[PDB]
Subunit: 240 residues, 4 copies
């Protein structure tokens, strides 16, 4: 039985990824940053559905907590076959001097965090393993106030491509999944139906994509059908 670590699996896309990987037969480490309640709910949903999982706290941007995370994750089953990095933040801030704090925070959490996870994955994933990062489709649109977020995720994609090359000879694929707007609980919670309808109309399929539809592409990349997909950023956005 193969083991998968999923960062940011307490809610939303990360939770959907963790639950789908558990359904696919992976033992899932549900990594979370702060309050364990949602993470333990993820673990319990996995166990009730017939899978195995356990939760580990770690801030992905804290090098010491990441060192511990990977040791503790390896302690469970002695192996780390798949690593999926979904944890990140998306604050809004225009490219102005006053936004410098927000910028630093996003870079710290999304990009440095990604580096940490990827770096440790590169050291611990076995031959034949898989490393998957979550990027974003909004990189293609360059919307105002998304500067810091887009910068962080573009950096992540760059790291993904380089790492795919650096792991030559280990038969380890490195890819990214870049979702568009996704119908998480948080997404719906902050929006009126009119706002939802406008976002739905942005895609030619004219609806809101679900977290499970993102997790399905992650599951492809983690499984046998993803054996020959390497150094790719797959945008999952309904055509938007």
């Amino acid at each position: 039985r193969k083991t998968a670590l999923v960062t940011g699996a307490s809610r939303g896309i990360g939770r959907a990824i963790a639950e789908r990987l558990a359904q696919d037969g992976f033992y899932v480490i549900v990594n979370y940053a702060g309050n364990k309640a949602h993470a333990q709910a993820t673990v319990e949903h996995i166990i009730e559905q017939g899978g195995q999982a356990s939760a580990i706290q770690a801030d992905v941007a804290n090098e010491h907590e990441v060192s511990r995370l990977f040791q503790e994750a390896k302690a469970i089953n002695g192996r780390l076959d798949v690593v999926v990095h979904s944890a990140g933040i998306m604050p809004m801030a225009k490219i102005t001097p006053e936004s410098l704090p927000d910028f630093d925070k996003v870079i710290h959490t999304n990009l440095r965090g990604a580096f940490l996870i990827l770096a440790h994955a590169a050291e611990t994933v076995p031959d034949g393993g898989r490393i998957i990062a979550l990027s974003t489709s909004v990189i293609a649109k360059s919307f105002p106030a998304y500067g810091p977020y887009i910068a962080s995720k573009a950096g992540v994609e760059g790291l993904v491509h380089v790492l795919a090359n650096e792991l030559r000879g280990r038969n380890i694929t490195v890819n990214a999944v870049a979702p568009g707007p996704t119908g998480t609980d948080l997404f719906y919670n902050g929006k009126t139906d009119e706002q939802v309808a406008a976002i739905a109309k942005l895609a030619p399929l004219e609806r809101i994509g679900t977290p499970d539809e993102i997790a399905g592409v992650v599951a492809m990349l983690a499984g046998p059908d993803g054996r020959w997909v390497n150094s790719q950023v797959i945008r999952v956005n309904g055509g938007f």
Copy 2:
């Protein structure tokens, strides 16, 4: 549910047809010239427990494609998935002497794609999927690949536009872009040194198989591909 696969006689097209049959689709194996390999594909599908049938059609001939789609949809009254894999890849540098070759590739690869996509746009139901095969070599722009790259870049353009034109029909349009794959043909015309040289190009350091391409096609044709739309997915082991 029914899937039509063009160029399904051998290689990547055959692997696609067989995997889709294994995923539960009734498969129309479309072929160009000699039936034999197409019927072998049909028989392998039936042998493994699936349903399939073979139909002849030149993808670049409007009348033969119109007939292909009328007949394919007539089998079960539906054409849920259309996969366009048929194409040719001749080598010719960009010189006036290559004009015949250029015309040929554009005719088979680009006009062909236009036809298939067009008829797919007319016949696929709500919730269906349209998938074209492009190529990863677009990224490298190697000498003598000019005509081939031009045809396939045009195909990708059609894919994105069609994805937008089918707004309101709930139909995804995507492309899969393989690198070199270990077909039977790939192996018959190469020495072991050539194969070894190609194997080292990918960071995974081996030769990709047709089944590894068919797996991504199957993702796009199945439940996990519902929210993938207007994408060109390159499947090349990282090369």
Copy 3:
């Protein structure tokens, strides 16, 4: 050897972007061959505008998608000064047609004029441009938007870009750059005469600069690519669209 003036051939130079390219290249010191397809009047107007401004130019008829007329075009154009330093391929059509069986004629036409035409020009350029010369094709920025009814056009221009990249590699050792310029919507006389003011305003707002780009603004990038500042730019598609 050759003390004749540096020469540029510009296809589709009768009007619009092609005309602006021809006039700007003449201002930069090129003898300009104004290639046109059908009615000479506008092509001769381009030539006369060039000559009134103190440049040298002459007009040659050829349909860029006709191999025989293109063979003649290059024989005659190179004969003027014994050289063809720069080749700019601007000629093309942009009809609207959705991806449907009934659109097949239109598709065939666009592919024929835009892509096969490009192939001919590029191919002949590859045979005639000297070491240090420049080959520039015109593509389109609309490739990025994949608008409905632009399928055939986008397919044709994406094919052109593919040819550009390959040709840049095939001319290794000849020191010949091959590039494309991809304009967004441009304020040609045709553009303004066929658009309502509300349509014009809607298109103007698409770019962050909130205006309609001019043909001279496209020609300026072409001139960069054809001159000393473009020496190290090779195998690029430069989108000139005001940020849209």
Copy 4:
């Protein structure tokens, strides 16, 4: 009277850009980080050839030094028409935990620095001005050990596109120039005759690109022929 600020103008591409902009009629602020000697050499060559320039020290990643840089630069002629951000570093480090210091360094100097310069440029450049960042062509190749550098420059490109959108209504273009390897003195001093020969055969033009060949594209973007070029990353690499 028209003014251009060039960061990293002490040597190499930045110097070539400063000298070309001066030759094009700009008053040039030669910004440097530490090495005053070379910055004054630039400033001098400009004055020697008939131009006007002056040097200003600032570490582009220091918010206070950058605020001062822009205050002082704008004070010279009361205007700052063009801003070109060329300053950056390119250390080699694979994606492993031990590389975290190098990573942190590059992100700080290349990306946070870019954020600062662009942010202040967006505040100080007049309507009709130009903002040009320097990226890199190596993003296309994702070579091993280039991970951190590529991540930083990919982030810069993201910021460029977003800023182009955020300055809607101000008539300010934001672009990047992405050079390949260039025949700097730094480039040549660490290389053998055969190494140079091998690099020279990478491009189809089969030679080494010069800093002036990059500066010519920057100058196009800063001048009348660049009025309609916006939100673009122009790769200047001889076709490699």
